[PDB]
């Protein structure tokens, strides 16, 4: 990772919190192409000082995202590890993450919008699958909206997949259980089972989010009941707009080896 000095970063408003992290809007002062000076809007993702012992996994997450370059993967600009800070500096995405956007625009997101976003996410995951690169935390909170749909010019929405954060292979068990049903059953059994099939399950859960208007699946269940949901081999209810429900359930297969390739997922989406 490129090293960015603290002096070149300005922290502005808080945008929220993640697992052992806090996120801010900020500005990066930099020399850009042709030697021009720029003040660039950035997302600043800060590891909590109390959780400094996760710094390797925290940065390994971003390192994953920058191993490869792709139009549907968030851009990491660098890191700031001056002083006692562990900061990831990322591109600033004006419209934020899809969990919020789906709730706020629930009245005007239709089947075609959801299909286009699902296709784009499946394209990103196919690229990761072809490169045998595990993401490990696919969810609507980690999908960023670069561009809104503009029917007046035909333009579809455009999304990117953000970094997974600290890996489920190192997080406390209680956090993994709270993350059912994004974390697949085999990873609740043994977080070391994380592998490419993990991301097919979580893609199903994310498609359920995209079809459910801001709702979080199983949010009414406490952690014990989420565990028992897996023990009883239940599936998520179909979204009211159920066009993708069979794909959701085929991806959320309790047998990891039976989950379909992202090539097959893409062919299924193109059939609709
Ligand atoms: N790479 C990223 C990631 N998230 C945002 C973002 C934008 C916004 N308008 N509100 C937000 N609220 C929380 C996060 C966020 C921006 N850029």
From Swiss-Prot:
Domain Protein kinase: 9-272
Transmembrane segments: none
Phenotypic consequence of residue 3 to L: In myeloproliferative disorder with erythrocytosis; requires 2 nucleotide substitutions
Compartments where found: Endomembrane system; Cytoplasm; Nucleus
Outcome following mutation: residue 81 to F: In PV, THCYT3 and AML; risk factor for Budd-Chiari syndrome; somatic mutation in a high percentage of patients with essential thrombocythemia or myelofibrosis; leads to constitutive tyrosine phosphorylation activity that promotes cytokine hypersensitivity; no effect on its ability to up-regulate potassium voltage-gated channel activity of KCNA3
Entry comment on modification after translation: Autophosphorylated, leading to regulate its activity. Also phosphorylated by TEC. Phosphorylated on tyrosine residues in response to interferon gamma signaling. Phosphorylated on tyrosine residues in response to a signaling cascade that is activated by increased cellular retinol.
Tissues in which the UniProt entry reports expression: Ubiquitously expressed throughout most tissues.
Modified residues (Phosphotyrosine): 34
Annotated site residue numbers, Breakpoint for translocation to form PCM1-JAK2 fusion protein: 174-175
Role noted for this protein: Non-receptor tyrosine kinase involved in various processes such as cell growth, development, differentiation or histone modifications. Mediates essential signaling events in both innate and adaptive immunity. In the cytoplasm, plays a pivotal role in signal transduction via its association with type I receptors such as growth hormone (GHR), prolactin (PRLR), leptin (LEPR), erythropoietin (EPOR), thrombopoietin receptor (MPL/TPOR); or type II receptors including IFN-alpha, IFN-beta, IFN-gamma and multiple interleukins.
Family: Belongs to the protein kinase superfamily. Tyr protein kinase family. JAK subfamily.
Domain characteristics, as noted in the entry: Possesses 2 protein kinase domains. The second one probably contains the catalytic domain, while the presence of slight differences suggest a different role for protein kinase 1.
Subunit structure: Interacts with EPOR, LYN, SIRPA, SH2B1 and TEC. Interacts with IL23R. Interacts with SKB1. Interacts with STAM2. Interacts with IFNGR2 (via intracellular domain). Interacts with LEPR (Isoform B). Interacts with HSP90AB1; promotes functional activation in a heat shock-dependent manner. Interacts with STRA6. Interacts with RHEX; this interaction occurs in a erythropoietin (EPO)-dependent manner. Interacts with ASB2; the interaction targets JAK2 for Notch-induced proteasomal degradation. Interacts with MPL/TPOR.
Disease linkage: Chromosomal aberrations involving JAK2 are found in both chronic and acute forms of eosinophilic, lymphoblastic and myeloid leukemia. Translocation t(8;9)(p22;p24) with PCM1 links the protein kinase domain of JAK2 to the major portion of PCM1. Translocation t(9;12)(p24;p13) with ETV6. Budd-Chiari syndrome: A syndrome caused by obstruction of hepatic venous outflow involving either the hepatic veins or the terminal segment of the inferior vena cava. Obstructions are generally caused by thrombosis and lead to hepatic congestion and ischemic necrosis. Clinical manifestations observed in the majority of patients include hepatomegaly, right upper quadrant pain and abdominal ascites.
Protein name as it appears in the record: Tyrosine-protein kinase JAK2
Lineage: Eukaryota, Metazoa, Chordata, Craniata, Vertebrata
Name of the coding gene: JAK2
Residues of the full protein shown: 537 to 808 of 1132
